[PDB]
């Protein structure tokens, strides 16, 4: 085999904090954590998001099947942030106070 595509990204990815999903509904994108408590989104350039907190678990998926877009769940060690991206709004913001490992 052979890599069908290969893109070098300008940031250092965190080990287990990588997810992919359609955030516009009809456009898959790659979400990935980064040092300094940030998260970048590769759309096809790169869009940054300020968590200001050391991520410990990231994931994309359908949180409400009414619509189709994928929520972006950025679990901090002391938080949890579902976050619609096509609109700069969040689906919720809870504090678990135990952790998001």
């Amino acid at each position: 085999l052979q890599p069908v595509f290969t893109l070098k990204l300008r940031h250092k990815i965190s080990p287990r904090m990588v997810a992919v999903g359609r955030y516009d509904g009809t456009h898959p994108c790659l979400a990935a954590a980064t040092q300094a408590g940030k998260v970048f989104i590769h759309n096809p350039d790169v869009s940054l998001l300020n968590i200001n907190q050391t991520v410990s678990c990231l994931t994309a998926g359908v949180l409400n099947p009414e619509l189709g877009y994928d929520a972006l769940l950025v679990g901090t060690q002391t938080n949890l942030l579902a976050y619609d991206v096509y609109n700069n709004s969040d689906l919720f913001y809870r504090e678990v106070a135990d952790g998001a490992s």
């Binding site: 609109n87 700069n88 709004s89 969040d90």
Partner: protein, 63 residues
């Protein structure tokens, strides 16, 4: 006010609409929606919600 401090205008619009679902005609909620739509520079909806405030108050200085 908090959701606007975090720079999330659409969360604030949804919260205002949920409030207007609880309080079906509150002028403060409608005027908040209008202020948001006018800060997003969408006068087409700011004026519609100010017109709703008018249909409710008719002495509103802001509207």
């Amino acid at each position: 006010k908090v959701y606007i401090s975090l720079d999330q205008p659409l969360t604030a619009l949804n919260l205002f609409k949920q409030g207007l679902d609880k309080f079906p005609g509150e002028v403060t909620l409608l005027c908040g929606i209008a202020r948001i739509y006018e800060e997003m520079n969408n006068i087409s909806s700011a004026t519609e919600y100010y017109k709703e405030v008018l249909k409710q108050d008719n002495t509103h200085v802001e509207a």
